[PDB]
Design an enzyme around this catalytic site. Sequence first.
Site, PDB file in Angstrom:
ATOM      1  N   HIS A 205      33.065  36.225  38.394  1.00  0.00           N
ATOM      2  CA  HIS A 205      33.659  37.381  37.676  1.00  0.00           C
ATOM      3  C   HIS A 205      34.883  37.032  36.856  1.00  0.00           C
ATOM      4  O   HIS A 205      35.084  37.423  35.701  1.00  0.00           O
ATOM      5  CB  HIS A 205      34.058  38.458  38.692  1.00  0.00           C
ATOM      6  CG  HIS A 205      34.860  39.617  38.191  1.00  0.00           C
ATOM      7  ND1 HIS A 205      34.281  40.645  37.476  1.00  0.00           N
ATOM      8  CD2 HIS A 205      36.174  39.947  38.306  1.00  0.00           C
ATOM      9  CE1 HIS A 205      35.180  41.552  37.154  1.00  0.00           C
ATOM     10  NE2 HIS A 205      36.331  41.149  37.650  1.00  0.00           N
TER      11      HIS A 205
ATOM     12  N   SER B  81      30.506  40.643  33.565  1.00  0.00           N
ATOM     13  CA  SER B  81      30.055  39.764  34.649  1.00  0.00           C
ATOM     14  C   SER B  81      28.963  40.457  35.439  1.00  0.00           C
ATOM     15  O   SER B  81      28.611  40.075  36.553  1.00  0.00           O
ATOM     16  CB  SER B  81      31.245  39.404  35.552  1.00  0.00           C
ATOM     17  OG  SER B  81      31.700  40.577  36.227  1.00  0.00           O
TER      18      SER B  81
ATOM     19  N   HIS C 171      36.700  37.881  32.841  1.00  0.00           N
ATOM     20  CA  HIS C 171      38.083  38.012  32.402  1.00  0.00           C
ATOM     21  C   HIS C 171      38.566  36.970  31.420  1.00  0.00           C
ATOM     22  O   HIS C 171      39.175  37.289  30.391  1.00  0.00           O
ATOM     23  CB  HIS C 171      39.036  37.910  33.621  1.00  0.00           C
ATOM     24  CG  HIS C 171      39.113  39.206  34.352  1.00  0.00           C
ATOM     25  ND1 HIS C 171      39.806  40.302  33.874  1.00  0.00           N
ATOM     26  CD2 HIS C 171      38.565  39.586  35.532  1.00  0.00           C
ATOM     27  CE1 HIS C 171      39.702  41.325  34.717  1.00  0.00           C
ATOM     28  NE2 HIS C 171      38.954  40.892  35.716  1.00  0.00           N
TER      29      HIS C 171
ATOM     30  N   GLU D 292      38.621  46.543  32.527  1.00  0.00           N
ATOM     31  CA  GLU D 292      37.492  46.280  33.433  1.00  0.00           C
ATOM     32  C   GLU D 292      36.164  46.802  32.900  1.00  0.00           C
ATOM     33  O   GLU D 292      35.200  46.026  33.006  1.00  0.00           O
ATOM     34  CB  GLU D 292      37.736  46.880  34.824  1.00  0.00           C
ATOM     35  CG  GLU D 292      38.305  45.832  35.779  1.00  0.00           C
ATOM     36  CD  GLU D 292      37.209  44.974  36.373  1.00  0.00           C
ATOM     37  OE1 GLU D 292      36.236  45.510  36.939  1.00  0.00           O
ATOM     38  OE2 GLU D 292      37.344  43.750  36.273  1.00  0.00           O
TER      39      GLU D 292
HETATM   40 FE   LIG Z   1      38.274  41.907  37.395  1.00  0.00          FE
END
Ligand SMILES: [Fe+2]
Lengths: 307, 307
Positions: free
Chosen positions: A168, A232, A173, A213
């Site tokens: 992730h 992700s 990110h 997010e």
């Molecule tokens: Fe995150």
Amino acid sequence: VPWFPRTIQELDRFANQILSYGAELDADHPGFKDPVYRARRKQFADIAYNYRHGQPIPRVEYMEEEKKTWGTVFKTLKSLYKTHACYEYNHIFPLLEKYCGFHEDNIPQLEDVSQFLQTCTGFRLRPVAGLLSSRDFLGGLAFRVFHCTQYIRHGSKPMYTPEPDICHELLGHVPLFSDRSFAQFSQEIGLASLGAPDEYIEKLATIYWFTVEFGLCKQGDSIKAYGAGLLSSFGELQYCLSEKPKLLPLELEKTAIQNYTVTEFQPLYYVAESFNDAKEKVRNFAATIPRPFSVRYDPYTQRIEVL
Amino acid sequence: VPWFPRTIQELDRFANQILSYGAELDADHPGFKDPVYRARRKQFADIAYNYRHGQPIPRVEYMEEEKKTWGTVFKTLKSLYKTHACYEYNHIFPLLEKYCGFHEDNIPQLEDVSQFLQTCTGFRLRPVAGLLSSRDFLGGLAFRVFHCTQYIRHGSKPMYTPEPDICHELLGHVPLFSDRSFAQFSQEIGLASLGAPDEYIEKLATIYWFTVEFGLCKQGDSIKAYGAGLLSSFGELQYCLSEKPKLLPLELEKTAIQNYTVTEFQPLYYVAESFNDAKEKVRNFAATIPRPFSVRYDPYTQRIEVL
Ligand SMILES: [Fe+2]
Ligand SMILES: [Fe+2]
């Protein structure tokens, strides 16, 4: 007024304020009954526990089983990015593959990724073991510091994780932190948080959810994903650009109080006009937070100036 | 357009573009007939020659004779600072004494001084052997980099130097670089210089002379010295605040073309209202320099952005 770090070294206090009894300890965790996985998680937590600002992030030799898990996530997600991810993502991804070892048979090391982000925007990584408070996580962003997990999800369920793991962080990110406008936008959220009352921290955490997010952004006449949790997630990344969800313009007085859940696909997404426009909106929202001072980061001294 | 560095590492090119046949080689240099002093100078030049950005600056063990020379300059100048030097100078000097070893029996090491300036404003030092071109010296300032000599003047004439030596840099230049406003002002001169035509470089060099080197500033209702060449000159520091020189307000269309000589006390000084006001004036002057682009330093990546 809540304490906040004023120098980048002062982020070191966070490591002794994490949730100590983590997700891998729960009966329904995919790795719960695996004592080897348990010990592996503890080993990664000990690296984050002992880490101190200024140090290089310890490299780890990942097991073959870990690399297999990474490669499954990597190859299945990578098939969606050209069509579903924003330009900034696709622009940087080949350089991550070239200079950071982003490939299906290799888990990138956080020290290499951190030096790469530093060259792009000043962002750096710190390893983190478990769950930070929202206040502490956001405050790191004021310093262009991203607290990053090093562990990987259990190999029994490669397409599923109940928590942020290294897949992730690196595929979700990291690529956006390579972009200047995105870096400025996320830092703005961090700056808004410093010394904010808990009530406003929750609001900034909610803006964060709906932007960093799970955000979508306009791109020419189209819409693309930029949220880490979308990038992700193989299933939600395809869903978020389908006819099914509801889309609304990013509007922070609204977005800040919107409820959401973490266990299904989001029924609603907010669309940012651009990262610069989102940043302006965060700056305006932050002026509404009761704080008896104003804050600015000085990258030359890595200190927050408080007025 | 003249080449200019775009990254802080690119300052490394300067070391292979210095005047190779330096002042210590001249028959009238105080140390000319001293072969030991000759070899000492060559040793310091070799350290600057081999220095590369990112490295720590090699420490040197100074001889007793060198420390004696330093102590004479230090104790005779220090007697004037409380009354003649600007507030920013006096404010930082006790911290230099406490944390950098500024004392009459000890020559501070440039690595320590550099880490100290970094904490104050991001400025750093690089050792330099001989004379840089104005273009290269000024360009370093764009990066908040000060090229700094490590050698000391010949001990036969402790109160005299025909060149910048370590006493001039440390007692004259360094304390002002600890101040944010001064750091921003001097960086502005560096930024104005990048890719400027030689004709404007000479003008910026002349503004530099009348500000960073020999400037006076208003301070409440008084006037104080801030120029490095004043602060490291016992005789001129007292003269510059006497009735003898002429004083004029800093006015860069005038200051930029004013002639001066280096071998006597200045007959004329320019008075800055403040370092912020001087900085504004430099910024305005720089917009008048024919350059087909605009420049900005990014301290997060240590790169110059060219538009
Ligand atoms: Fe995150
Ligand atoms: Fe000087």
